[PDB]
Amino acid sequence: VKELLEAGVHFGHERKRWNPKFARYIYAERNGIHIIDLQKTMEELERTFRFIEDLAMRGGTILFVGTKKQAQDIVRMEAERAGMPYVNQRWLGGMLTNFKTISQRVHRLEELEALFASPEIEERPKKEQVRLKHELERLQKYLSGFRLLKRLPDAIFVVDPTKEAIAVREARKLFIPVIALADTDSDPDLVDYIIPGNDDAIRSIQLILSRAVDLIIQARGGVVEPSPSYALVQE
C-alpha cells in the first residue's frame, strides 16, 4: 500500500492554476503539472487516519461528499460500505445548516415511502399520484445516503474541498473536522484534515476512499473487499 501503490496510478494535478500554499505541498512542477510530495502525503494520511480511526472506534460520523460524476458514484458505494451518510447527486445548502428543515424533508420522504405501502392503490386521485411519483423519485435523487443522518456528523469525508468548499464553508463554519481531499486546486488551511492528492484520477478516488473506508471498518472490525473500482475507472 501507501506511497508505492500511489506511485501505481495517481499523484498531483493542476497545470499552474495553483493556490500558493498548496504548492507548499509540492515536489517539482515538471511538464506543467506540480508533483504532489507523497512523502508529506504519508505524514498527512498518518494524522488523518489517526483521527479517522479515532472517530471510527468511537463511532461519531463522517460525511461523504462527492459531486463530480466520477467520485460521485464511487463515493456512494464506499460510503455504503462504511456505514456513513453521504452526498449522492446534488449538494444542497440546507443540509449543513438547515439540518432540521431537511430532517423534515426526510420526514416527508419517509411519509411518501410509508404511503407506497398504503391502500392508495385504491381510491385517491391519479394526478395526485403522478405528483407523488415525481417528488418521490427526485427526493431520492438528492437525498440518498444523507437519508439516515440525524444529529450533526463530527467530521466529513468529502472529495475536492472547493466545490466541496461550498460544502466545507458550511462545515468549516459549524466547527466540524473537514476530512476531505484534493489537488493544488484548493487552498490548504481551509481543509481541516488536509489530504493532498489528485481528484482527477478516478483511481486516486478509488484508492484513497476505499482505503479510508475499509480503515474505519477495521476500527470496527470486519474488513471485506473494495467493490467499485477499475472497471468504471477506465472502461
Partner RNA sequence: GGGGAGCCCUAGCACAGGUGCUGCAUGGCCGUCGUCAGCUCGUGCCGUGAGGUGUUGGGUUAAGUCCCGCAACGAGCGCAACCC
Binding residues (CB under 7 A) for RNA: these are 89-94, 96-98, 100-102, 104-105, 127, 134-135, 138, 141, 166, 169-170, 173
Name which of 44 and 164 has its Cβ closer to RNA: 164
With CA atoms as reference, report the closest residue to 113 among 144, 87, 83. 144
Q: How far is the CB of 45 from RNA (least distance, A)?
A: 29
| Complex with RNA: residue 91 or 157, whichever CB lies closer | 91
Nearer to RNA, 16 or 131 (CB): 131
C-alpha–C-alpha distance, residues 138 and 31, integer Å:
44
Minimum distance from CB of 51 to RNA (Å)?
Answer: 24
Taking the CA atoms of residue 146, residue 150, residue 153 and residue 159 in that order, the dihedral angle to the nearest 10 degrees is 0
Secondary element (H or E) of residue 154: none
Minimal distance, residue 168 CB to RNA, in Å: 11
> Whole-number minimum distance, CB 128 to RNA, in Å?
8
Which of helix, strand or coil describes residue 65? strand
Nearer to RNA, 64 or 91 (CB): 91
Nearest approach, Cβ of residue 107 and RNA (Å): 11
Check: CB of residue 232 under 8 Å from CB of residue 201. Answer: no
Least separation in angstroms between residue 176's CB and RNA is: 13
Beta-strand runs (E) in 48-192:
179-182
Residue 51 CB contacts under 8 Å (≥ 6 apart), including other chains: 155, 177, 179, 193
Is the CB of 6 or the CB of 164 nearer to RNA? 164
Residue 25 or 91 having the CB closest to RNA: 91
Q: Rounded to the nearest 5°, which phi and psi values hold at 141?
A: -55, -55
d(C-alpha 205, C-alpha 76), whole Å:
12
Neighbours of 204 (CB within 10 A): 24
